[PDB]
């Protein structure tokens, strides 16, 4: 799979439910919901190593990760974690979550790609599942 490109957001599903089962007060999933409707993503693949840039209206998160390789990130809401990305299968990777500091609701992402191009993103916050499609600028 090859997953290099600029992609823009076609479809959002159940984020902000996500942002509140995590806590989020109305206020900041508001501002989040509206600030992550029109998203920059940027991915550069290099065989199993991965950079991927994604972009708000007010915030930037970048991370660089190889399938395999433990590496920092931060969740969802914003909580820094140690994160480890796996193969599930050709075209679709899997990474579990855990909290560098304390405690909270099992968190979790995968990435995969369709035949048709779409990029498929998978939030999920114990049993709450958010799923956002893009595809390539």
Known sequence: PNFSGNWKIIRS??????LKVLGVNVMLRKI???AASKPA?????????????????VRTTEINFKVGEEFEE???DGRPCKSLVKW???NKMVCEQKLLKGEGPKTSWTRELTNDGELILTM??????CT???VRE
Not at 13 to 18: A, D, K, P, Q, T
Not at 124 to 129: F, G, K, L, P, R
């Open 132 to 134: 956002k499609v893009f």
């Open 74 to 76: 931060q969740t969802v």
């Open 13 to 18: 599903e159940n984020f902000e439910e996500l």
């Open 41 to 57: 993503v940027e991915i550069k693949q290099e065989g199993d190593t991965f950079y991927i840039k994604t972009s708000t209206t």
């Open 88 to 90: 599930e299968s050709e």
């Open 32 to 34: 989040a919901v509206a």
């Open 124 to 129: 999920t916050a114990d049993d709450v599942v």
